[PDB]
Design an enzyme around this catalytic site. Structure first.
Site, PDB file in Angstrom:
ATOM      1  CG  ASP A 149     -22.525 -13.683  49.927  1.00  0.00           C
ATOM      2  OD1 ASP A 149     -23.232 -13.008  49.152  1.00  0.00           O
ATOM      3  OD2 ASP A 149     -22.073 -14.810  49.616  1.00  0.00           O
ATOM      4  N   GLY A 154     -29.944 -31.377  46.294  1.00  0.00           N
ATOM      5  CA  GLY A 154     -29.259 -31.141  47.564  1.00  0.00           C
ATOM      6  C   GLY A 154     -28.147 -32.146  47.830  1.00  0.00           C
ATOM      7  CG  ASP A 207     -23.209 -20.323  43.658  1.00  0.00           C
ATOM      8  OD1 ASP A 207     -24.048 -20.369  42.726  1.00  0.00           O
ATOM      9  OD2 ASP A 207     -23.311 -19.540  44.631  1.00  0.00           O
ATOM     10  CB  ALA A 247     -18.056 -14.005  42.650  1.00  0.00           C
TER      11      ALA A 247
HETATM   12  O1  LIG Z   1     -25.452 -19.191  45.863  1.00  0.00           O
HETATM   13  C1  LIG Z   1     -25.152 -18.333  46.985  1.00  0.00           C
HETATM   14  C2  LIG Z   1     -24.930 -16.906  46.441  1.00  0.00           C
HETATM   15  O2  LIG Z   1     -26.157 -16.343  45.985  1.00  0.00           O
HETATM   16  C3  LIG Z   1     -26.135 -14.920  46.042  1.00  0.00           C
HETATM   17  O3  LIG Z   1     -25.736 -14.405  44.774  1.00  0.00           O
HETATM   18  C4  LIG Z   1     -25.138 -14.594  47.132  1.00  0.00           C
HETATM   19  O4  LIG Z   1     -24.301 -13.484  46.774  1.00  0.00           O
HETATM   20  C5  LIG Z   1     -24.404 -15.903  47.449  1.00  0.00           C
HETATM   21  O5  LIG Z   1     -22.987 -15.789  47.328  1.00  0.00           O
END
Ligand SMILES: OC[C@H]1O[C@H](O)[C@H](O)[C@@H]1O
Ligand SMILES: [Mg+2]
Ligand SMILES: [Mg+2]
Lengths: 287, 287
Positions: free
Chosen positions: B13, B200, B230, B42
């Site tokens: 990133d 959100g 995530d 990840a």
């Molecule tokens: O959700 C954010 C992620 O989306 C994309 O996959 C980037 O690599 C970032 O880490």
């Protein structure tokens, strides 16, 4: 062979082809990402080297993998790196997004370029110092002062535009030559001895000690005009006379810079579009 | 101790802080730039791990210098890598842009991730499969099929939207749980047994076999929303009952995911903002 010293920025340009820019809270996938070394300082340094100057680049790389690529790029173009530095963190980064309606969105972060330290003994023994504004003003200022003492021409590309008025005053006072497009010129606080204003396809105009005149560009059909500014600045520095100079030499340099800027439009891309000195000669004879 | 298997993407990133999100055509200068390991796959693995799960990641790295930094990031967070592969060429790249109001845009060049094909051992001995859509949908589909055969929960983060329609359809047909924001839920072919629509900082909405209801999230002043989804996803996977489950266990999982997600907004940074199991607990006790 004219000796040029560039104190300026180096960026890794990341070009993403997308359908549309991502909206807030959205993830978008690019069709492609292409990595190309760039940044004003490095572009100008390459332009100057291809034009036949002996170039030394003084700038800052990050400790990222990008930094290795920027180093390879400059070294391959015969640009000297004796006097660069490695600072922790990312290299200067430019993000370029091309969308489906062929609009370009650009996002630049100084990265390492913000941590650049003047190297006065490097600007010693050089004829021309060329600097721009992607590094901090103070550093450009420091370098400009060293060049003044060494009797080297102080040439500032007033770019990017939108720099804060009074932060630039001390640098304006000390520049012999200032290069700028029309928009950039408006943000420059006071006229130098030699103000050179670029005019896209048309070429350039001059206003200063030698008077007032237009300098037209050989006519050509563009492929890509990006990168033509940096070529102009590099070829100007490679051609500007050492002190005290003469109008005919400054004029010769302006025509050469125009020709080269015109040639840079013939090639796609930013960092690789600088013509060789022979091509500039050719293009000038052909008019 | 729940065994979660993430099949998905890992990216390096580049995070930019801006005042305002760049508009088509604009050139913006950024306030800061960071370079940190990430990727939906990840991030979700790491979040699941910090939440108390026992986690294996199955993705594709490039054979490039970034790969080592990405691998190291997963191992440092206790994520397993035995089922990962290496695709020659670049690892994935993402550009995250964060603005004043803590909003974010994400743009990804998937690189190696677009060449992840189904890895044989990929899903063995897992309670929950969590997948997303930066990898080929066919590969996410294959992982889903193998998870059902072993009676594991098929959990899909339906992001990004707009992927290969027929593969999407096949995957939507068998998915147990789909996590998606409102825009992404829309693009999804057909509803899963448990549809988790995120909202959100408001938390989440449930549609499915347990009925229809909201799950509020702790009220917080967001510092940075990038990566919070995530976290929600991974925390969800880490807490979702072995099929079959009680409505109470599903509810507890949604509650923890919302709490976690909201915690993740208090921290700058994408791949590193997931809270420990105890912080989720402490946040839930304080309501
Ligand atoms: O959700 C954010 C992620 O989306 C994309 O996959 C980037 O690599 C970032 O880490
Ligand atoms: Mg060009
Ligand atoms: Mg965050």
């Amino acid at each position: 062979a004219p000796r040029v010293c560039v104190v300026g920025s180096v960026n890794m340009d990341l070009t993403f082809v997308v359908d549309a820019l991502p909206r807030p809270g959205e993830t978008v996938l690019a069709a492609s990402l292409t990595r190309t070394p760039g940044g004003k300082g490095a572009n100008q340094a390459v332009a100057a080297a291809r034009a036949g100057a002996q170039v030394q680049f003084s700038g800052a790389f990050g400790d990222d993998p990008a930094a290795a690529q920027l180093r390879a790029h400059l070294r391959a173009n015969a640009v000297g790196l004796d006097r660069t530095v490695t600072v922790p963190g990312p290299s200067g980064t430019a993000i370029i997004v091309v969308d489906a309606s062929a609009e370009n969105t650009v996002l630049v972060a100084p990265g390492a370029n913000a941590h650049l330290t003047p190297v006065p003994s490097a600007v010693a023994n050089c004829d021309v110092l060329l600097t721009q504004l992607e590094i901090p003003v103070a550093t450009a200022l420091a370098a400009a002062r060293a060049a003044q003492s060494a009797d080297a021409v102080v040439m500032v590309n007033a770019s990017p535009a939108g720099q804060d008025r009074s932060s630039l005053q001390d640098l304006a006072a000390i520049a012999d030559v200032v290069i700028a497009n029309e928009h950039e010129a408006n943000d420059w606080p006071s006229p130098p001895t030699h103000f050179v204003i670029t005019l896209g396809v048309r070429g350039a105009r001059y206003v200063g000690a030698d008077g007032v005149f237009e300098v037209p560009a050989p006519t050509v059909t563009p492929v890509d005009t990006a990168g033509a500014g940096d070529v102009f600045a590099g070829v100007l520095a490679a051609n500007w006379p050492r002190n005290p100079g003469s109008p005919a030499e400054r004029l010769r340099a302006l025509r050469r810079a125009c020709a080269a800027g015109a040639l840079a439009t013939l090639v796609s891309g930013v960092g690789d579009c600088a013509p060789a000195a022979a091509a500039i000669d050719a293009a000038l004879r052909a008019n």
